[PDB]
Design a binder for this molecule. Structure first.
Ligand SMILES: CC(=O)SCCNC(=O)CCNC(=O)[C@H](O)C(C)(C)COP(=O)(O)OP(=O)(O)OC[C@H]1O[C@@H](n2cnc3c(N)ncnc32)[C@H](O)[C@@H]1OP(=O)(O)O
Ligand SMILES: CC(=O)SCCNC(=O)CCNC(=O)[C@H](O)C(C)(C)COP(=O)(O)OP(=O)(O)OC[C@H]1O[C@@H](n2cnc3c(N)ncnc32)[C@H](O)[C@@H]1OP(=O)(O)O
Ligand SMILES: [Cl-]
Ligand SMILES: [Cl-]
Ligand code: NI
Lengths: 159, 159
């Protein structure tokens, strides 16, 4: 199992949406309803929005959008948003069958490496409080809860 | 997510084979080849063999064959073989998306409960040495390595 991390490109769009869908159905099985998720996928992970995000990342602006590829097949992705010297980890998702193999850790390290290249010293995120899979991974990797907003925990990491 | 543990019945056959297939492809992705697995599924998990095993379990003889059912859908199974006062854990497999939720632990506890009812004080198993997922679960649950046979570790638990 060879895993490559690289910036996503527009050709990654269609399988990106499928990874997102598959990871979302799994991750939130006890949190949101099947329809809530299908609408979320349709509205937030639309072809147009992701394309624009993939482009802003490729153009080296306010998005960093990396995928993990297993034998050329996209199986995970991370997306950060940069404003000034700070980042927000918007998204980190893998195909459920590819979890617990350090692939999430690998995407995070890559982003962190690029943030350090960019002078970004703070990174923060919003995680649904009932998402133990995600929440536990984050605190195991140096994120600390600093606040809440609705159902989410606001976690933050400094460098 | 409601999980029920009960003895398998002949009507469980077709979805039993699919769980086995899906768990096998995942579990041994870096261990055996796609064909080795498809042959193993075809030859060891055949309709006839499993049926006979399900029957011997239902008849209360030398097999104990339990499934874990999530909302009426079979998602995992355990199978033990009894000879005298001792057992061998032949099989324990879940759909990959259902792992890491204590469902494996739940099947093991059920079998252990029945073994104790039956006076069975020793339980042993063979785990492929490169199966870290399975091997780690077993030692986290009181199994200790006592020997090897080919690629497998022979692990054993006493009560
Ligand atoms: C800001 C946001 O994007 S929030 C949404 C975060 N993403 C999700 O929840 C989607 C579902 N999960 C995933 O995609 C992944 O598990 C990630 C990205 C959260 C973590 O990546 P992975 O490569 O799976 O994790 P990695 O192998 O580095 O670390 C393992 C740890 O993560 C957590 N974890 C990873 N996979 C699993 C799993 N299948 N079941 C339970 N916990 C898991 C555990 O805490 C585990 O620690 P343990 O060994 O003590 O049990
Ligand atoms: C004799 C034989 O049958 S050998 C074949 C054994 N079965 C397999 O390997 C098939 C693949 N795996 C599985 O079906 C299951 O993981 C089982 C049956 C081994 C364990 O059942 P689960 O309900 O998943 O495990 P449970 O939640 O009780 O325990 C979690 C522990 O099991 C292991 N584990 C369970 N799921 C995973 C996973 N997706 N990735 C990595 N490790 C895992 C870990 O050691 C975990 O401990 P951690 O929290 O420290 O990481
Ligand atoms: Cl979340
Ligand atoms: Cl094994
Ligand atoms: Ni774990």
């Amino acid at each position: 199992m060879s895993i490559e991390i690289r910036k996503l490109s527009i050709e990654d769009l269609e399988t990106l949406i499928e990874v997102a869908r598959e990871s979302w159905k799994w991750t939130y099985a006890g949190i949101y309803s099947e329809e809530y998720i299908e609408s979320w996928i349709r509205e937030k992970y639309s072809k147009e929005k992701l394309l624009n995000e993939i482009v802003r990342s490729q153009s080296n602006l306010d998005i960093l959008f990396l995928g993990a590829f297993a034998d050329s097949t996209l199986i995970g992705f991370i997306e950060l948003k940069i404003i000034a010297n700070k980042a927000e980890l918007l998204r980190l998702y893998l195909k459920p069958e590819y979890t617990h193999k350090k692939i999430g850790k690998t995407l995070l390290l890559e982003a962190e490496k690029i943030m350090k290249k960019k002078g970004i010293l703070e990174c923060r995120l919003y995680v649904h409080r009932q998402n133990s899979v995600g929440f536990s991974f984050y605190y195991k990797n140096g994120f600390k809860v600093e606040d809440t907003d609705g159902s989410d925990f606001i976690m933050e990491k400094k460098y």
